[PDB]
Amino acid sequence: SNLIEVFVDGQSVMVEPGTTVLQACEKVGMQIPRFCYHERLSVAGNCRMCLVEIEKAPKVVAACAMPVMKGWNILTNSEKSKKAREGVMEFLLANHPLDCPICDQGGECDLQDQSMMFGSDRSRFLEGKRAVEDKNIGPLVKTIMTRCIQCTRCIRFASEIAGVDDLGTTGRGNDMQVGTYIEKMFMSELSGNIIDICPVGALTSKPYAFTARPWETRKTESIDVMDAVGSNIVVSTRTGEVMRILPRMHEDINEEWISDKTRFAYDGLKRQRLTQPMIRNEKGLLTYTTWEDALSRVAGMLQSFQGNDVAAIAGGLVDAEALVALKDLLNRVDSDSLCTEEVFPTAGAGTDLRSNYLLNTTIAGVEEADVILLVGTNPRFEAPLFNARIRKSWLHNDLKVALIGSPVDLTYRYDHLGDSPKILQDIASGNHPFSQILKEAKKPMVVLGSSALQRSDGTAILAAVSNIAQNIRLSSGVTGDWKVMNILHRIASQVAALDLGYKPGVEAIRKNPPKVLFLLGADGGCITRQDLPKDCFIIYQGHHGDVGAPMADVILPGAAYTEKSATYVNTEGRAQQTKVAVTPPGLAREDWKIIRALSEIAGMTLPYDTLDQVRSRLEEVSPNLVRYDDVEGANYFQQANELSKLVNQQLLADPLVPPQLTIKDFYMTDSISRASQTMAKCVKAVTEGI
Amino acid sequence: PTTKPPTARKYIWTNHKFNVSGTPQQYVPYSTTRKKIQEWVPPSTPYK
Amino acid sequence: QLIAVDEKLDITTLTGVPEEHIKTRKVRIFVPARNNMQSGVNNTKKWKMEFDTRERWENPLMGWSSTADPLSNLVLTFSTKEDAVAFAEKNGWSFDVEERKVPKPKSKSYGANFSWNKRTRVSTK
Amino acid sequence: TRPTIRPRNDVVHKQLSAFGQYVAEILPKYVQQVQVSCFNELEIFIHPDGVIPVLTFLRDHTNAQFKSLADLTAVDVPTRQNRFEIVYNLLSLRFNSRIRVKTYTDELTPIESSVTVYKAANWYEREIWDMFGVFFANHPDLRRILTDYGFEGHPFRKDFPLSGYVELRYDDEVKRVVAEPVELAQEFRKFDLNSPWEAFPAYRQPPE
Amino acid sequence: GTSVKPIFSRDMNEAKRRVRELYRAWYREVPNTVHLFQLDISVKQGRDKVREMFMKNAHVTDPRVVDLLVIKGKMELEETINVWKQRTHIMRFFHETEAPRPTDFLSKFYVGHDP
Amino acid sequence: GVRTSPTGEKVTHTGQAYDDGDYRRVRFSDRQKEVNENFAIDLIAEQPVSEVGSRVISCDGGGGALGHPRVYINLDKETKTGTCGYCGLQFRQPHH
Amino acid sequence: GAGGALFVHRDTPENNPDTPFDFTPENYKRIEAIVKNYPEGHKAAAVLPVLDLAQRQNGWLPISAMNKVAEILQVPPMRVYEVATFYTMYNRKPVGKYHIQVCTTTPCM
Amino acid sequence: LGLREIRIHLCQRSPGSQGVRDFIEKRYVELKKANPDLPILIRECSDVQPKLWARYAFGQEKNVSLNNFSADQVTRTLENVLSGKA
Ligand code: SF4
Ligand code: SF4
Ligand code: FES
Ligand code: FES
Ligand SMILES: [Mg+2]
Ligand SMILES: [Zn+2]
């Protein structure tokens, strides 16, 4: 067709027009050495390490920028290419400091590896070296500027991916330097990624400094639970301890980036940890005890009370296995008061249709839209990688963005329609010009954040947004698989809980105050002892001492997300499973194992004994929870719209306000991050200039 | 050493010790690192 | 001379592995992710089989890292996922397979950095 | 290219190539492949059924005369359907040459014992059986040679763990040496050394 | 089909015959083993252990695997008869210094994290 | 910079001392606890800062090939001093 | 030899973001005239002249002048910092009333 | 003793779920109108088989195959479980 034939080392290949020499060499499986080229950043061409010889051409070309020409014959291993690489490595190493034993990049250095592979083995440089002063760009990214090779990757990432123009180059020639020119903190929810993309030890992790070397680390591929995006990560450990968190490439979800909370809150896993079962002594103080005693006390209280009296609240970091185990245990005592801390409207379709509470378009889809409307949510802090995808579409696909809410800074320009929820109705009726804008859009997308749903008028807000979606659908028809309707979540455990039949919100607890309460990692402070009768038996299960721990009668130490193989469902409805990096500390155990042992002690033994059996039970309840990369779903928007049209709950004259108003709020949100000293440093840095 | 004395440093031992094995001055190995996981401290006040 | 055996291959009783490390183990068959600290892709070419992580504790003397898991270090390299699956099946290990993830082809264009009316134009260089 | 690079020998390369062609022409029933390595070593890849004929020819032929078996061993490659690669190294004193013969097998398929052709193989085949679990048919006395009495499994196999499954200690209650499941005070620390950048372009594999 | 080459037996009947022969030989050897090694077990215990080791592999349906199992059992018998083995090797079958590891869910949950 | 814990045990340069309820202290009863008395952090804190009349200085730890790899230290910041990342020596330009 | 001038900025009581700088009304008329030459949507192209204009009114370029140019042209301040540190005719420190520049290149030497 | 929840698992594009799909296309809406407090969960399922699940008091469950059922058969089965029968 439009393919052209080119040759890499005399071997034919077909490439699309405009393909660079580097990509053509990659088609046959050859990797051209690089320092400044990154396939997710704009092409720079500055390093000059990618220079290659084209047959019958006297001048070497830059493979990362030059488009292949039909009939060209690249020669990646000719004498000219090798001498070019040797000369460029020589110029790169001329002023580089002899820092490898003290550099954190030591065994992970692209400069070191490409020096070993493509450069010479000697120096003929006999002059003094240049040295530059260090920059301070905050508490997360350590800066040692002498090591900089002037690739400019940090500048391109900050400008294009992060949306900030704080980094740059001052001066010129040999003295040219990368920095901010003023005392400025490069603070953003995606900042830590400049450590990954920097090929040298110029930009390093400050929390990670000096602790480990790459060859000793063990790599566990896992998933993040700090939000509802479900970013793929690698947990690096050494001798039973978590060293750091790295991104793992997933094209569909997080690409090769992760947010700063995903990257830097792991140290909170080492603080305020519940390690042994605890009970209240005669004086009403929490004291350590054995597993048997605590389980017997809980089982006694469970046997006495049945049905409505027994209740459970699930927190933000709970997995599907524990959720289904708790659901079965409370069902055996005829209880249906199984709730979450995050409210989703139960009116109409509610949880009956999955399509109703999921981001139907998906993260990948944003790249195929041209108009997006965001209602009552801050995409940047509730889902930083989702906001990164939105900015990528805004930059490369000219995506038009409009927002209804407080004018938060999203790092890209959008249309602020206001903050009054009544505007939604105005859009639904058709009196707003944005109604015409959505009417003519080929791939319109409407996104409603779950945070907006938390307020009392949320059922009304969802009805109005569904009305907007219905108007778009009836005017333009259905193009096929587009799924205009979307719900943006912020809690990792919410989608699986809804998939399991859990009732969203804590309303049923207030309606029917229970005598036995199961706090399963619930630290939101929603239900206190003022909302419960006296002599209420509160059981807390989790890994951190937070809001939910010091108000309990029995404390059961559970495992964090890094210490179990557990299932999480993201905003898209995709199901992923974590892997054990380290075992739980002290006497802590796996959460579903705690629930199963407690069921056995109380006489109503649960049918499952292993993890495969509990995942079979999970499949029995909701079969989509065992498909570990599938995101395909059926659209039931018409039924949900019909069911939503029934009630007509009134809106409020209250401006929509996101909980994460500013950057400081982004850091400490859950119990793991609240226990992190790095997040405390970040909060202190964004509140105090210094 | 009388005609070629060693270089003087202030951290070099001024008093040589012999093999002190099998003696209350013997070396006993131990871990030199600090505690890794800190446990939650329950509050000292009653909850009701 | 050929005898036409009809059954699935099974060598567990000959390997000498204790039954605990045959039935309660889960292997992972996967192509390892590229280390995000580097751009080389040479460590993402072959399939790997590795066992589930077991308990590690602290040695009372010296505080070293102690284990009781004999398979905590074993990593196997395979050309294709089918070979890894066949090995795990004939050795009697429960396995989880993950499809290979490749980076998608991206359309690069240097001239886009200087767009006349597009958003792609670079503010710096 | 002079001082630090190993010099070549094209005469020996030609002689070994011609002799490999000779061997392949004489025994087409078994010879599957013939190779001459860059440092002048000749290898002949055969079918297992031809272990005894080939070696016998290579020992008795007037133009061969490889009367000495220098070594015999196995290599474990788990990705191959036939796991084990059997390697015979032969030396000819009359012609001052060396040859390598390679064949393959799996866990359940015996190889013909070559004690009749070479007396030296006895302990080599016992060692291969002990370390890899490859049975040799018609062996005069096949049993473990290197491992402990009653030791289960084969240590040289890739799947077998480096420290094994059991350890030994003296127990005073039973007044004897006992075998127990291995526990390690310090776990062996696995290092990941492989560089993410390719070292040798000449060996690059097609991108599949 | 499946194109396999045998070791000794062509079907499960010959393999079972060889298994029975090896079982007879072990059964005859047990009293001599108890006498020579000065073991504190009874002959009944030794024959029970022989039966238990044979029944560990009762599920095998491949004649080649059975042939290899008989070869290994014959290797062990030859080893025992010639006294290559010591009393520690014979007693390793009984695991006399190994504390019983529980199999029910609750005890496993109490002791640690391993299933 | 030695100092004892409330239990009478010497605290090492690392800062590790067994806690009051830690049984492991029993390993020192009838024996001693090995503690090195020359704290490096204190000894390097006594060295005088070297004043040099150039923006960029070089350090190799002394002794030429017997020291550390040679590194170059920038001395443009006047609010602090340039510190060697190998030896810990400090350098500054003549200020005020 | 070496440049001598530093390419970082440290605040001083005489050069900080709160140092008073503002264009004269005549300079604002000149800024409007300068801006008009370039195509609409490409207003930044005026960074080079307008910055120079600031230096022609003040004598040098305090950090507040760079901030004012960045705010007037709606360009990120780091871009103006890049322009100011790249070009050698921009004075990021005060100079004398008369700036003597003697050529010492080879034909002139 | 009483109904607590219903679960319907239907394959997205298998022929044997086709009739069940029609049910959800037409007859699910009014069935939810009649039962505002009964949780009915519609979930996707593996190439295996379509199914319906009924939960009772104290966690008692049993399932009914809906393979090749037409929409009328589906709603008949649903009204049979919804009533005091079977
Ligand atoms: S960045 Fe690489 S080459 Fe430079 S000092 Fe660090 S390890 Fe060495
Ligand atoms: S700090 Fe790192 S990413 Fe930024 S320009 Fe220097 S080498 Fe490139
Ligand atoms: S990778 Fe092409 S010039 Fe840097
Ligand atoms: S003006 Fe002096 S060299 Fe040109
Ligand atoms: Mg870096
Ligand atoms: Zn030094």
Side-chain angles (χ1 to χ4, degrees), chain A residues 103-105 108 141-142 192-205, chain C residues 36-37:
Chain A
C103 187
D104 272 322
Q105 206 67 39
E108 268 162 338
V141 178
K142 189 194 209 172
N193 297 283
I194 70 177
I195 297 153
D196 280 315
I197 57 150
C198 177
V200 283
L203 299 183
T204 44
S205 182
Chain C
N36 226 51
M37 304 293 279

Side-chain angles (χ1 to χ4, degrees), chain D residues 73-193:
Chain D
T73 193
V75 186
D76 188 39
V77 195
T79 198
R80 287 161 186 180
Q81 163 195 339
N82 293 307
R83 216 186 152 168
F84 305 111
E85 171 164 322
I86 318 294
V87 184
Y88 305 76
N89 281 289
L90 317 175
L91 160 77
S92 178
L93 289 83
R94 172 70 54 218
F95 302 116
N96 196 14
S97 290
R98 292 184 183 272
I99 203 163
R100 184 173 313 129
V101 180
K102 302 224 263 152
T103 194
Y104 51 88
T105 193
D106 62 19
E107 298 96 315
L108 303 181
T109 310
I111 303 281
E112 260 300 312
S113 171
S114 50
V115 286
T116 52
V117 182
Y118 292 106
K119 265 143 270 191
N122 200 305
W123 280 25
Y124 286 117
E125 284 164 9
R126 285 182 58 191
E127 208 223 334
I128 285 171
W129 156 254
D130 198 358
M131 287 321 87
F132 296 89
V134 180
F135 188 73
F136 282 89
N138 320 123
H139 192 283
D141 176 42
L142 194 83
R143 49 185 171 105
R144 81 180 67 249
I145 180 157
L146 285 188
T147 44
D148 189 14
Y149 306 109
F151 179 89
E152 307 146 309
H154 311 283
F156 287 7
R157 229 171 256 207
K158 286 286 172 178
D159 35 355
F160 200 85
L162 175 67
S163 286
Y165 293 103
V166 308
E167 50 199 359
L168 263 53
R169 71 171 178 87
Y170 179 79
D171 196 271
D172 193 68
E173 169 194 306
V174 290
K175 290 280 193 299
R176 70 170 179 274
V177 163
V178 300
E180 293 174 302
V182 189
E183 279 212 352
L184 286 167
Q186 183 169 36
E187 184 187 9
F188 174 85
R189 289 158 275 164
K190 175 164 68 68
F191 287 168
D192 275 327
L193 309 173

